[PDB]
Write a protein that binds this ligand. Structure first.
Ligand SMILES: Nc1nc2c(ncn2[C@@H]2O[C@H](COP(=O)(O)OP(=O)(O)OP(=O)(O)O)[C@@H](O)[C@H]2O)c(=O)[nH]1
Ligand SMILES: Nc1ncnc2c1ncn2[C@@H]1O[C@H](COP(=O)(O)OP(=O)(O)CP(=O)(O)O)[C@@H](O)[C@H]1O
Ligand SMILES: Nc1nc2c(ncn2[C@@H]2O[C@H](COP(=O)(O)OP(=O)(O)O)[C@@H](O)[C@H]2O)c(=O)[nH]1
Ligand SMILES: [Ca+2]
Ligand SMILES: [Mg+2]
Ligand SMILES: [Mg+2]
Ligand SMILES: [Mg+2]
Lengths: 430, 437, 54, 330
C-alpha cells in the first residue's frame, strides 16, 4: 500500500495526464465511473498505488489537476474519463500564464500554488505510506513549466524525504507554440536538476519524427504525439502498478537508475511503435522487441545513444513470452554492444517481465535509459537559448514580471554544467 | 538439550526460512496444524527436535524462529500461507517501507527505529530456552534490509548474548536474479560490520544454484521458489545434526571447532549431491562413491570456485540415507588418489563423517526427486576467496567513480565507511592467500 | 587410513577418518553511531530547508 | 561476432593471434578491462582466473592453464618429478636435480655429490654457474636455485664440434588434447664445445659473446628438415626414431601427470595453453628434459604457421567461424 500522488499542470500536462489515466484505468479494469470490471486479481493487487477506494468499491485516481486557465480542465471533465477524477481536486485560476515562466513561477502561479498544496496535503494524509509524487507537464509553456517547478519546490519543502518524479515534455521548433520556449525550458531544467529524483525526458522533436518517419503520419496532431506518450508512460509505470521484483517502487528505481544526483534525466523508449487505430495483427518476437526497444528510432528523446554511453538501463517486457528468451536477448544486446555501457558500473542493465500486456498488443517492451547522450537534448535547448539571449530578445516579457537578467544567466550556466557533467562520464574509463 | 533460534531477515531470509521450516516439518512429521502425533511427550520435551521447536500445552510444535522485514508483503504471505498456524504473530515482525536496496538505510535510518523491538521479540524466545546455545541468521548480501539491518542485529546480539554462537546463511549476489546495481556495495558493507560477530557463515551464490537448477533439474528459468527449495535441502543437511540423534556437530559450537580454525576465515564451502529432477522417468540411483566424488566437482558447489588451487583447513561429510562407514572410506580412498586435495601443513588430512539413516525428504510436487542416499560436504577451503575477489573488484570499479555513493551518505553514513569496509576485505583476501599459498 | 571415535545410534552413526597427520563494541558505542548518523541526516535536511527558504 | 581482450602486450605469439583473429572479420577486440569477452589472452603473472566464467551468456576461454606453473618453474618441476609417482624418483629422462635455498635439499645433494667424486660436473640455475666444485656452486647461490647434473657428453653437431638444444612447441586445448607442432628448432652453439658462450646455447648469449654467430645456419638455428638429413647422413637414422619418440613420451608423461590438477573439463571456464619444451640429447641419442616454458616465443619463420594453428585448434574449436599438429594420443 505504497501510494503515489499524481499532479498534472498546464495544457500539455493535463492532456497527457488525462490520456495516462485513460490507459492505465483500462489496464486495471476500471471504467469511467470508477467501478472495477476486470478478470484478473493482478489488476487489483497494487491498485492502491494510483487509486483511492471509496464506498461501493469505487476506485478514485489519486490525481490533482492544475492550470491557470479552465480551458483544458473543462475538456478533461467532459472527456471520457472525466467523471472518474475527484471534483475537488480540480484546482484552476482564470488569468492564464501566457507561455511565460515568470508568470507561472513568481506572480500568477504564486497566487494559486497554496490552493494546490492544500489538495496535495489532503491526499497525502490519507496515505498509508506515501512513496512520493509524479508530475506531468511541459517545459516550454508557462503554467506547467513555471508553476510546475514552483509546486515541485514547495512539495520538496513539505515532503523532503519523499521521491519527486516528473514526465517533462521538452519543446521543439518542429512543434513550437512560441519563440520563448527555450527560455522557459532552460529556466525549468534549472529547477529539475535540483529538485527531482527522476525525470523522463519526453522530446516533442522525437515524438514528431516518430509520427512522421515511422508511423507515416504526414500531419502529426498532439493526439498522435500523446498516443506515444501515454504508451510510454504506461510502460515505465508497469513495475509500479503490478507485482514485481525490480524497480517496484519509486525509490528503488532511483537507486538503480541514478548513479549521481544531478544525472537523473532518463531517455525513454517503446516497442512496437504503433499509431492509433493501426491495430496490428502480428505479435513481435522477443528478438524483435529487443532490437527495436534499443533502436534510436524508438527513443522518445531526440538523442543518438551511439553518441554517448549508458550509465544504467531498465527494460520492461509485457505479455506472455519466454523469460528464458528475454534473458538471452537482453544478454545478447549488452554482449554485442558492450562498448556503449560503462564498464565501471557492472551489470547496469536490469530487466523485468509482466504477464499483462497493454491493450491492443500481445507483446511490448519499454526502455528507460540513463545515457550521457541526453546532453544532446540540453545542448540543443542551450543553443536556441543563447541565440536569443545574446541580444536579450523577448526578455521584456520576463523583466516585466520582476525577473532579472542574472537569473537567466544562472539558469544557462547550470544547464551548461549539466552538459559538461554528462561529457565527463562519457569519457571516463575504468 | 540446547535450543537454537532462527532469525530470518529480509525477503531472501524470510522466503528461504519458509522453505526450510516447511521441510523441517515434513522431516519431523509435523503438520501445518503444528501437531506432531509421534511426539508422545505432550506440552514439553527434552528431545533433539526441541532444539528448533517449542511445545504448547495443546501439543502445538512452534518454530523457535523470528521473521523480520522492513516491508510487509513477504511476511504477509507467511501470515496467510499454509503454515500460518505454525507461528504466532509476535514472531513475524514487519515495517512499512523497506531499505530500498540501501545498506545505510537498513542499518542506520530504518534499522534504528525497529532494532529494539526485534531484540525484545528475540528476548521472548530466549526466555523460553533452558540452555540457548545460539542463533542461525538467514539473509541476503544484496538487499538493504538483509545487509543493513542484519549487521546491526549481529552487533547487538553479541551484546545481549555474548556467550552464544552465531551462524549465518548468506545469499551472495548474482546478476541473473539480482534486483539492484549496488549489491556489491551492500555485500562488502555488511560483511565488514558482521565479520567479528559471526562465528561461521555459509555463503550461497545465487549463480551456482541457478545453474544447478538449469543443468540438473532442467528448469529453463529458475524462480526463487526453485532456488529456495534446493537451498533448504542444503540447510537441512547442515542442521540435521542439531535436530536429530547423532555425535557430529550436535551443537553450534562444534561447527566453529570443526570447520573454523582461524576466526576471520569462517566461510566453509558447501557441496551437495545428488540433485535429480523429479521429471526424469528413468534414473539410476547413485552409489556412495558416485555422490562422494561429486562433492569435488565445482558444478555442485554452493559457490563456483576451484578448490584444487587452494588448501583445506577442514572437511566434513554429512550423509543422509543408506550409507555405512565402510562404503564411505572406500570412496574416500579412491578419491584421494585421483583428485587434488591438499590440506594446510598445520591441519590433519582427514574427514569428519556424519551419517543419518533417514534419506533426504523432498517436498511433494517439488522439483527434486527422492534418492536413497545423499551427501553434503562442508569444506573450509581458501578457494572460496575467489568470491570475495569478484565482489571486491565490482566494488572497486564503482567506488572509483563514487557512483551511487550519495544514496548512502544521504542516509547518514560517512563516505569513510566505504573505504574502511573495503580495507577489511583487502586484508581478508590477504589472509586467505597466506594460508593457501 | 585410520578410523576413530566411531559413534553409533538407531538414527545413524558418525566417525572421523585421517589419511595423514599434520606436518566487541558496547551497547553505548552502538547507540552513538546510530545517533551520529541521525544528526548528519538532520543537518543535511536542515541545509536543504535553509536553501529552500532562501 | 566473438569478442576478446589482450592483457599481455609483450607477447609476440599472441600479438599475431590477435592480428589473425581480427583479420577474420568475426572477432572484435575490446578494452582490456571489459569483462564481457569470449576469449582472454591474459597477462603472464597474477592472471585473475577467479573472475573467469561468471558472465551469463558468455562462453569464456583463456590462453593459460591455472596450475601449469608447477611445470614451468625450475624448482617446482624438480619437486613435481621427485614426488609424483607417475614420474617417480626413478625418472630416466630428467637430469639428477636438487632444490637449494640461499642463506631444501642441500644435505641430500652433498650426500650424492660425495658419492660422485669417489664425472662430477653440475650446473646451478635460478645468471648461471657451471662448476665441479660444489663449494663454489653453493657460494654462488647464496650471493632460490636448482643444482642439476651437467651433461658432460652432449651430442655434437659437425662441422663445428658444437652443442645444441631442441625446442618443441606443444598446444593443449580445452579438451586436454595434446598437440605437438610439426616444426621444432635447434638452438645451436656456434663455438666448438670445449670440455675444459660455448656451453650455453642461449640465443642471447650467442649473439653477444660469440664471434662465429650465424656461419653454419641462420641465427644459430637449425630446423628439423636439415637436422633430420644430418642424422641420416652422419648416423644412419631419423629424427623420428632416435629423438622424437622420446620427446613425445616426455611431453605426454609431464602433461598427463598434471592433468587432474589443471584440467578445465567440468569447470565454469575453459583453458588452453602453448608450451615450449626444451631438450638436450647426448652422444647415445638419449633425450633429456631441461625445462618447460609456459609463455614461449616462436622462431621467426614459424610464427605464421603456428599462430594460425592455435586459432584453428584452440580457439575456433570453441568459437566456430562462419594439420600442422601431431596429436599425442593418451
Ligand atoms: N536465493 C534467494 N535469493 C533471494 C531471494 N529473494 C531475494 N533474493 C536475493 O536477495 C538480493 C536482494 O535482497 P532482498 O532480500 O530481496 O532485499 P531485502 O533484504 O528485503 O532488503 P530491502 O528490500 O532493500 O529492504 C538479490 O540478490 C536477490 O537475488 C530468494 O527468495 N531466494
Ligand atoms: N643439465 C644441463 N646439462 C647440459 N647443458 C645444460 C643443462 N641445463 C642447461 N644447459 C644448457 O644451458 C642453457 C640454459 O638454458 P635454461 O633453459 O637452463 O635457462 P632459460 O630458461 O634462461 C633459457 P630458455 O627459456 O630460452 O630455454 C640450455 O639451453 C642448455 O644449452
Ligand atoms: N506532446 C504535447 N505537447 C504539448 C501539448 N500542448 C502543448 N504542448 C507543448 O508544450 C509547450 C506549450 O506549453 P503549454 O502546456 O501549452 O503551456 P501551459 O499550459 O501554460 O503550461 C509547447 O512546447 C508544446 O509543444 C500536447 O497536448 N501534447
Ligand atoms: Ca515432546
Ligand atoms: Mg498551450
Ligand atoms: Mg525487501
Ligand atoms: Mg624459463
Amino acid at each position: 500500500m505504497r501510494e503515489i500522488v499524481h499532479i498534472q499542470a498546464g495544457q500539455c500536462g493535463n492532456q497527457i495526464g488525462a490520456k495516462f489515466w485513460e490507459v492505465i484505468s483500462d489496464e486495471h479494469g476500471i471504467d469511467p465511473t470508477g467501478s472495477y470490471h476486470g478478470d484478473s486479481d493482478l489488476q487489483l493487487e497494487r491498485i492502491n498505488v494510483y487509486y483511492n477506494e471509496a464506498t461501493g468499491n469505487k476506485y478514485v485516481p489519486r490525481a490533482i489537476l492544475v492550470d491557470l486557465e479552465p480551458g483544458t480542465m473543462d475538456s478533461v471533465r467532459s472527456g471520457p474519463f472525466g467523471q472518474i477524477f475527484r471534483p475537488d481536486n480540480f484546482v484552476f485560476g482564470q488569468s492564464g500564464a501566457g507561455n511565460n515562466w515568470a508568470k507561472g513561477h513568481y506572480t500568477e502561479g504564486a497566487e494559486l500554488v497554496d490552493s494546490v498544496l492544500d489538495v496535495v496535503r489532503k491526499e497525502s494524509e490519507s496515505c498509508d505510506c506515501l512513496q512520493g509524487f509524479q508530475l506531468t507537464h511541459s517545459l516550454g509553456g508557462g503554467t506547467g513549466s513555471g508553476m510546475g517547478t514552483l509546486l515541485i519546490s514547495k512539495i520538496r519543502e513539505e515532503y523532503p524525504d519523499r521521491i519527486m518524479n516528473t514526465f517533462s515534455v521538452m519543446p521543439s521548433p518542429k512543434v513550437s507554440d512560441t519563440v520563448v520556449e527555450p527560455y522557459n525550458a532552460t529556466l525549468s531544467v534549472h529547477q529539475l536538476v535540483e529538485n527531482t529524483d527522476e525525470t523522463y525526458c519526453i522530446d516533442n522533436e522525437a515524438l514528431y519524427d516518430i509520427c512522421f518517419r515511422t508511423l507515416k503520419l504526414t500531419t502529426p496532431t498532439y493526439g498522435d504525439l500523446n498516443h506515444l506518450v501515454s504508451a510510454t508512460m504506461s510502460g515505465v509505470t508497469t513495475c509500479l502498478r503490478f507485482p514485481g521484483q525490480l524497480n517496484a517502487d519509486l525509490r528503488k528505481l532511483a537507486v538503480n537508475m541514478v548513479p549521481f544526483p544531478r544525472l537523473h534525466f532518463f531517455m525513454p523508449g517503446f516497442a512496437p511503435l504503433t499509431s492509433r487505430g493501426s491495430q496490428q495483427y502480428r505479435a513481435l518476437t522477443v528478438p524483435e522487441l529487443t532490437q527495436q526497444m534499443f533502436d534510436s528510432k524508438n527513443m522518445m528523446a531526440a538523442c543518438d545513444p551511439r553518441h554517448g554511453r549508458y550509465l544504467t538501463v531498465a527494460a520492461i517486457f509485457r505479455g506472455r513470452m519466454s523469460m528464458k528468451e528475454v534473458d538471452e536477448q537482453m544478454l545478447n544486446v549488452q554482449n554485442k554492444n558492450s562498448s556503449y555501457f560503462v564498464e565501471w558500473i557492472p551489470n547496469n542493465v536490469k530487466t523485468a517481465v509482466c504477464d499483462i500486456p497493454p491493450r491492443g498488443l500481445k507483446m511490448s517492451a519499454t526502455f528507460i535509459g540513463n545515457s550521457t547522450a541526453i546532453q544532446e537534448l540540453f545542448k540543443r535547448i542551450s543553443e536556441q537559448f543563447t541565440a536569443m539571449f545574446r541580444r536579450k530578445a523577448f526578455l521584456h516579457w520576463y523583466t516585466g514580471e520582476g525577473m532579472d537578467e542574472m537569473e537567466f544567466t544562472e539558469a544557462e550556466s547550470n544547464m551548461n554544467d549539466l552538459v559538461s557533467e554528462y561529457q565527463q562520464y562519457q569519457d571516463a574509463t575504468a | 538439550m540446547r535450543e537454537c533460534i532462527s532469525i530470518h531477515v529480509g525477503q531472501a531470509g524470510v522466503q528461504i526460512g519458509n522453505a526450510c521450516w516447511e521441510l523441517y516439518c515434513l522431516e519431523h512429521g509435523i503438520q501445518p496444524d503444528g501437531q506432531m502425533p509421534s511426539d508422545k511427550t505432550i506440552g514439553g520435551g527434552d528431545d533433539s527436535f526441541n532444539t528448533f521447536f517449542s511445545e504448547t500445552g495443546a501439543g502445538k510444535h512452534v518454530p523457535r524462529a523470528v521473521f523480520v522485514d522492513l516491508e510487509p508483503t513477504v511476511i504477509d504471505e507467511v501470515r496467510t500461507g499454509t503454515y500460518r498456524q505454525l507461528f504466532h504473530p509476535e514472531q513475524l515482525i514487519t515495517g512499512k517501507e523497506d531499505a530500498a536496496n540501501n545498506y545505510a538505510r537498513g542499518h542506520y535510518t530504518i534499522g534504528k527505529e525497529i532494532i529494539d523491538l526485534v531484540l525484545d521479540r528475540i528476548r521472548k524466545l530466549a526466555d523460553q530456552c533452558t540452555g540457548l546455545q545460539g542463533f542461525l541468521v538467514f539473509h541476503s548480501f544484496g538487499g538493504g534490509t538483509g545487509s543493513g539491518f542484519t549487521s546491526l542485529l549481529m552487533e547487538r546480539l553479541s551484546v545481549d548474548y555474548g556467550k552464544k554462537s552465531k551462524l549465518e546463511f548468506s545469499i551472495y549476489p548474482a546478476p541473473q536474479v539480482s534486483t539492484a546495481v549496488v549489491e556489491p556495495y551492500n555485500s562488502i558493507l555488511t560483511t565488514h560490520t558482521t565479520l567479528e560477530h559471526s562465528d561461521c557463515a555459509f555463503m550461497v551464490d545465487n549463480e551456482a544454484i541457478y545453474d544447478i537448477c538449469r543443468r540438473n533439474l532442467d528448469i529453463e528459468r529458475p524462480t526463487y521458489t526453485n532456488l529456495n527449495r534446493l537451498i533448504s535441502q542444503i540447510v537441512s543437511s547442515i542442521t540435521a545434526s542439531l535436530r536429530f540423534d547423532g555425535a557430529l556437530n550436535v551443537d553450534l559450537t562444534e561447527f566453529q571447532t570443526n570447520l573454523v580454525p582461524y576466526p576471520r576465515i569462517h566461510f566453509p564451502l558447501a557441496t551437495y549431491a545428488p540433485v535429480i529432477s523429479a521429471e526424469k522417468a528413468y534414473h539410476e540411483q547413485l552409489s556412495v562413491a558416485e555422490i562422494t566424488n561429486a562433492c569435488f566437482e565445482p558444478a555442485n558447489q554452493m559457490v563456483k570456485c576451484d578448490p584444487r588451487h587452494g588448501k583445506y583447513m577442514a572437511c566434513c561429510l554429512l550423509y543422509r540415507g543408506d550409507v555405512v562407514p565402510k562404503d564411505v572410506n572406500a570412496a574416500i580412498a579412491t578419491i584421494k588418489t585421483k583428485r587434488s586435495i591438499q590440506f594446510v601443513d598445520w591441519c590433519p588430512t582427514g574427514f569428519k563423517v556424519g551419517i543419518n539413516y533417514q534419506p533426504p525428504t523432498v517436498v511433494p510436487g517439488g522439483d527434486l526427486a527422492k534418492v536413497q542416499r545423499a551427501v553434503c560436504m562442508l569444506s573450509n577451503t581458501t578457494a572460496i576467496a575467489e568470491a570475495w575477489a569478484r565482489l571486491d573488484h565490482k566494488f572497486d570499479l564503482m567506488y572509483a567513480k563514487r557512483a551511487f555513493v550519495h544514496w548512502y551518505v544521504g542516509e547518514g553514513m560517512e563516505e569513510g565507511e566505504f573505504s574502511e569496509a573495503r580495507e577489511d576485505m583487502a586484508a581478508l583476501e590477504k589472509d586467505y592467500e597466506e594460508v593457501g599459498v | 587410513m585410520e578410523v576413530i571415535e566411531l559413534n553409533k545410534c538407531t538414527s545413524g552413526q558418525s566417525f572421523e577418518v585421517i589419511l595423514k597427520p599434520p606436518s566487541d563494541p558496547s551497547l553505548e558505542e552502538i547507540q552513538k553511531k546510530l545517533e551520529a548518523a541521525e544528526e548528519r541526516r538532520k543537518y543535511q535536511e536542515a541545509e536543504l530547508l535553509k536553501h529552500l527558504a532562501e | 561476432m566473438y569478442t576478446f581482450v589482450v592483457r599481455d602486450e609483450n607477447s609476440s605469439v599472441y600479438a599475431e593471434v590477435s592480428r589473425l583473429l581480427l583479420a577474420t572479420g568475426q572477432w572484435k577486440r575490446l578494452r582490456k578491462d571489459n569483462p564481457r569477452f569470449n576469449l582472454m589472452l591474459g597477462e603472464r603473472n597474477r592472471l585473475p582466473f577467479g573472475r573467469l566464467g561468471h558472465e551469463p551468456g558468455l562462453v569464456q576461454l583463456v590462453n593459460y592453464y591455472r596450475g601449469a606453473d608447477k611445470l614451468c618453474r625450475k624448482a617446482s618441476l624438480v619437486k613435481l618429478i621427485k614426488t609424483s609417482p607417475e614420474l617417480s624418483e626413478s625418472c630416466t629422462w630428467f637430469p639428477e636435480s636438487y632444490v637449494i635455498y640461499p642463506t631444501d635439499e642441500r644435505e641430500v645433494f652433498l650426500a650424492a655429490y660425495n658419492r660422485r667424486r669417489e664425472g662430477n660436473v653440475w650446473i646451478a640455475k635460478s645468471g648461471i654457474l657451471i662448476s665441479s666444485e660444489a663449494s663454489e656452486l653453493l657460494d654462488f647461490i647464496d650471493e632460490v636455485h636448482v643444482i642439476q647434473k651437467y651433461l658432460e657428453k652432449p651430442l655434437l653437431l659437425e662441422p663445428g664440434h658444437r652443442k645444441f638444444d631442441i625446442r618443441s612447441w606443444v598446444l593443449v586445448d580445452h579438451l586436454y588434447n595434446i598437440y605437438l607442432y610439426r616444426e621444432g628448432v635447434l638452438r645451436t652453439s656456434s663455438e666448438p664445445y670445449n670440455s675444459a658462450t660455448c656451453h650455453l646455447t642461449n640465443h642471447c648469449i650467442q649473439k653477444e659473446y660469440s664471434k662465429n654467430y650465424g656461419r653454419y645456419e641462420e641465427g644459430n638455428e637449425m630446423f628439423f628438415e636439415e637436422f633430420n638429413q644430418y642424422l641420416m647422413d652422419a648416423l644412419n637414422t631419423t629424427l623420428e626414431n632416435s629423438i622424437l619418440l622420446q620427446i613425445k613420451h616426455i611431453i605426454r608423461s609431464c602433461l598427463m601427470c598434471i592433468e587432474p590438477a589443471i584440467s578445465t573439463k567440468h569447470l565454469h571456464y575453459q583453458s588452453f595453453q602453448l608450451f615450449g619444451f626444451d631438450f638436450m640429447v647426448d652422444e647415445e641419442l638419449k633425450v633429456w628434459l631441461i625445462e618447460v616454458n609456459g609463455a614461449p616465443a616462436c622462431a621467426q619463420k614459424l610464427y605464421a604457421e603456428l599462430c594460425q594453428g592455435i586459432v584453428d585448434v584452440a580457439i575456433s574449436s570453441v568459437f566456430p567461424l562462419a594439420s600442422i599438429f601431431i596429436k599425442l594420443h593418451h
